[PDB]
Design a binder for this molecule. Sequence first.
Ligand SMILES: N[C@H]1[C@@H](OP(=O)(O)O)O[C@H](CO[C@H]2O[C@H](CO[C@]3(C(=O)O)C[C@@H](O[C@]4(C(=O)O)C[C@@H](O)[C@@H](O)[C@@H]([C@H](O)CO)O4)[C@@H](O[C@H]4O[C@H]([C@@H](O)CO)[C@@H](O)[C@H](O[C@@H]5O[C@H]([C@H](O)CO)[C@@H](OP(=O)(O)O)[C@H](O[C@H]6O[C@H](CO[C@H]7O[C@H](CO)[C@H](O)[C@H](O)[C@H]7O)[C@@H](O)[C@H](O[C@H]7O[C@H](CO)[C@H](O)[C@H](O)[C@H]7O)[C@H]6O)[C@@H]5O)[C@@H]4O)[C@@H]([C@H](O)CO)O3)[C@@H](OP(=O)(O)O)[C@H](O)[C@H]2N)[C@@H](O)[C@@H]1O
Ligand code: NI
Length: 705
Amino acid sequence: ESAWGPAATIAARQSATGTKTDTPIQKVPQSISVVTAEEMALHQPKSVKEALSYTPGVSVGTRGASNTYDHLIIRGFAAEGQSQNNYLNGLKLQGNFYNDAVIDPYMLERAEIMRGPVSVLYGKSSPGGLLNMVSKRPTTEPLKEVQFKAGTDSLFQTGFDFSDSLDDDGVYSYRLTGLARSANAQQKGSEEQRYAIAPAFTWRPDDKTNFTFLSYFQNEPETGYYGWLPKEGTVEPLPNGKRLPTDFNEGAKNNTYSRNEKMVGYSFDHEFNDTFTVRQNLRFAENKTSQNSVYGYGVCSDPANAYSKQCAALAPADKGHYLARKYVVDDEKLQNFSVDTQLQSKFATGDIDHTLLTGVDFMRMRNDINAWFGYDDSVPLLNLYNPSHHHHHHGSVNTDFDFNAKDPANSGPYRILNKQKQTGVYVQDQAQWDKVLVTLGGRYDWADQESLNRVAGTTDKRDDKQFTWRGGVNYLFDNGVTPYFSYSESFEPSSQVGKDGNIFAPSKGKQYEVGVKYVPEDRPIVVTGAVYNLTKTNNLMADPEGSFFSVEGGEIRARGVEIEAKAALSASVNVVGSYTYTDAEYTTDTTYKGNTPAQVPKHMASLWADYTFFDGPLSGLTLGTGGRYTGSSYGDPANSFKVGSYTVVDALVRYDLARVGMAGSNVALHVNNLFDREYVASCFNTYGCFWGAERQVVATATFRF
Ligand SMILES: N[C@H]1[C@@H](OP(=O)(O)O)O[C@H](CO[C@H]2O[C@H](CO[C@]3(C(=O)O)C[C@@H](O[C@]4(C(=O)O)C[C@@H](O)[C@@H](O)[C@@H]([C@H](O)CO)O4)[C@@H](O[C@H]4O[C@H]([C@@H](O)CO)[C@@H](O)[C@H](O[C@@H]5O[C@H]([C@H](O)CO)[C@@H](OP(=O)(O)O)[C@H](O[C@H]6O[C@H](CO[C@H]7O[C@H](CO)[C@H](O)[C@H](O)[C@H]7O)[C@@H](O)[C@H](O[C@H]7O[C@H](CO)[C@H](O)[C@H](O)[C@H]7O)[C@H]6O)[C@@H]5O)[C@@H]4O)[C@@H]([C@H](O)CO)O3)[C@@H](OP(=O)(O)O)[C@H](O)[C@H]2N)[C@@H](O)[C@@H]1O
Ligand code: NI
């Protein structure tokens, strides 16, 4: 089983995104989860976000039903500025502002999640958090697949996945994966549209050389809902004791949101001899996104709208059932070039087998932003009373808004040019002294940035030089158990400027982790467990003397326990489950402190199992079901209020189409939120809450020719 290819069973024993070298999970000093393509082919996830609903240490409701971005919170932390922190084939998909890219899960072979500091091999990064997806590569045997989806809210999807060789030797092979998806968003008025295709070409001149061309082109006319809803009407009852239905939409009838993505690159490797292997991963991308968006701020009585006139012009008791709103017109375009070159030296030193990795990583990202942001009273208010029982028979779109002619009073232009560059040199060794595998290594990064404000004519720049290393040990037993512990570090530059008109210094990550991994060589089952102590130092916090500007020195701690399990308990039984304990807390902070950051539940857990029949008349029938538990979380930094826990159930019914001459093909039915439970996924503040996803039914027919 290769770290860059299929896994056979839902259990992947190999992963290269933790050490940059194909290594069995048990031999990796860090918490690494691997969602197989098979698993994704089980719930037909809408996004890579979803494909992670069962993996521990990851929240996936930081936006509820919305799918605009695969923005994740890992171990209580996320990248600064609501930015993603997602990697594709070992090279980061560096985005900026509203320009973050997403890859459709159908084009993936596997989605992996690295928990904890990751700079020792990838450079600047949020603490305890990294996602790396592996593009599908040409297959060893021919593959001709056609897929058809049909579901709730007018879900219609058609896609293909073909892979064959040009020559009988396989020196030349290709793979073309594409799809077209259209659907109505949960919220009335909003649509979801996606067209994508991934051309891939592999050239193996011999059994020691592999150059694989990887491209992805995707166009999304409409990405759907991305607004905020007040805790008043969702988490908490509105004055009239009623609530906004889960399909409510407080955006302009003419709200639009699109994104365009284009990337070309390659993954290369060559084995020179018995001790040296070289591998280079390169990708270049140009992505765009534009939008006309009216989003909700909170209700007119929300501290946020204190300085709002339209609000102050309402009877003191009515300020609590009227919704304040703002808007934003955006248009961005960025280019991202990335290349990682690495030499793998394999040699010994008397019983000490070494696996030395030495390489340099480079990336440059440029993102030009030209947008307009409406401030207070920038857009009409909305009454929240009408949303009663007759809605709940629901939706009811609203009215257009003049995104054009931006009043210089209520709105202002925002035009910035962000540049980013990072160069890293890392050295790592994987020395195994029989049953005693010791991993250790470090990296030095040159993190340079520069931002131009096309209006203030300002140009902020900062060049960070940072070092990070990681050390760990794995006692590879033989019965399978692989106890381990490791120390890791990460660093994350700031783009914010202090009162002294200067970019702040980077924040850092320090994690202490110990755990045990069970990867028994016989049965196809993997069971990991770990407890950790992660620390983010020099976080930004409110200036002690309140000055609009922020001050550094802040600190946050996140300690918890994570256990996950995936297995093939039978030729017909599969199971996946995990539990997560997350204790995140502001160690040092001006305003908050002792408070837990919003959107990070203390408890999370999931369990899923499927059975398949080969027996009687029910031969070729798979039935599966599972549940995901999200504990309560805080809906704001002040911890003013709380978002209640919830549990959602998923079900699956699959039927092998062999009994009609079509072996390998099948028809399936997937249900998400079986009991159509209504829940607020989370809130990042009193005015920003997100309804969870309502029950969704999808019918899939996937044929293999
Ligand atoms: N490494 C890497 C990096 O480097 P670094 O340094 O960074 O590190 O990077 C790089 C880059 O590349 C990339 O990019 C691209 C794009 O780019 C662009 C384009 O578009 O192209 C450009 C840019 O800029 C620049 C740079 O580079 O930066 C600079 C300048 O100066 C120049 O040089 C340019 C070119 O070369 C030329 O063209 O480049 C940018 O842009 C923007 O910004 C800028 C600044 O700020 C920067 O800093 C400014 O300047 C500009 O401008 C403006 O524009 C506008 C438009 O429209 C757009 O929007 C306009 O306005 P209006 O009002 O008009 O509308 C304008 O424009 C126009 O005009 C002009 C002028 O005109 C006049 O004058 C002149 C004289 O002086 C002329 O000549 C005449 O006479 C008159 O008329 C012009 O110039 C323009 O253009 C033109 O050009 C040519 C000539 O030469 C021709 O003609 C053509 O046809 C045309 O076009 C016009 O248009 C104004 O001006 C702006 O604002 C960018 C942005 O940022 C975005 O991104 O852009 C890319 O491509 P694409 O396509 O894809 O995009 C690529 O890919 C990449 N790579 C690199 O190279 C390296 O490698
Ligand atoms: Ni340059």
